[PDB]
């Protein structure tokens, strides 16, 4: 289930020729490189330890590509302005996600390529890496334009070739970092809520990777729809946090139990107030 992805964002700056461009690469959801046109010296840069391995020629080459990408997004942004009959006195956004996924058998599982305009799906490359799926009318224009130009072949080649090549490389160099886990440190807290009712909150802290599952149980049944689950958040040190709580009758807290499932936990935890 390993993967690599590049999330690119181009934001038009009204009146100015050049849009701001930011590119972020990820391996197994971990940011490993980043390029930002706003820097004093635009350049792709390491965002993870094991990328120190690469020599200068690597960063130079990636940086060159970024410059190419900037031009592409600039022209695309302009074209989109016309498709939607929008004024250029305002800012606009064009985003792209591309990359590859490795299945269980380390083979290529799927290639990805999708664009969004103003934060909404615009056009995407189908899993066949041959056909395009357009989200609206404007996108259809792009779609018909790319089928005639054979753009897909270009993307398919990167997705099944260079994409797989480097993902394997990065997985090999950052193996000791990417394949690690930090199982969660959990506990249950008790809080006032309302008359005759209290809140029990189950916390999971300092865990990695982010994937996790917390559940509450009453009489052997999980409280599927009577539980508040916050969205997973960054601790800021590379690990994540999360919690799930339930409002229970005062004097019956004991009847409830929390379970924490994480790939760092061979056996799921079972906590209570």
């Amino acid at each position: 289930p390993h993967s690599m992805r590049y999330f690119e964002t181009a934001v038009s700056r009204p009146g100015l020729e050049e849009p701001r461009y930011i590119s972020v690469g990820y391996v197994d959801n971990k940011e490993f490189v980043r390029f930002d046109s706003d820097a004093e010296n635009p350049r792709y840069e390491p965002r993870a330890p094991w990328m120190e391995q690469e020599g200068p020629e690597y960063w130079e080459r990636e940086t060159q590509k970024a410059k190419g990408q900037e031009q592409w997004f600039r022209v695309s942004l302009r074209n989109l302005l016309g498709y939607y009959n929008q004024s250029a006195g305002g800012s606009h956004t064009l985003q792209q996600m591309s990359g590859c996924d490795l299945g269980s058998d380390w083979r290529l599982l799927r290639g990805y390529l999708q664009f969004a305009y103003e934060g909404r799906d615009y056009i995407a490359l189908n899993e066949d890496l041959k056909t395009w799926t357009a989200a609206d009318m404007a996108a259809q224009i792009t779609r018909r334009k790319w089928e005639q130009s054979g753009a897909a072949e270009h993307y398919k080649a990167y997705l099944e070739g260079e994409c797989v090549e480097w993902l394997h490389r990065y997985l090999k160099n950052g193996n000791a970092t990417l394949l690690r886990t930090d199982s969660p440190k959990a506990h249950v807290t008790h809080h006032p809520r309302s008359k005759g009712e209290v809140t029990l909150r189950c916390w999971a802290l300092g865990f990695y990777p982010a994937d996790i599952t917390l559940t509450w149980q009453l009489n052997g049944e999980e409280l599927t729809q009577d539980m508040e689950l916050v969205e997973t958040r960054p601790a800021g040190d590379g690990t994540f946090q999360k919690w799930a709580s339930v409002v229970v009758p005062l004097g019956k807290e004991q009847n409830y139990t929390c379970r924490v499932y994480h790939e760092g936990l061979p056996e799921p935890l079972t906590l209570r107030w």
Partner: peptide
Amino acid sequence: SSLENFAAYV
């Protein structure tokens, strides 16, 4: 290694 888009723009 990042991808370089095809010559054809949107």
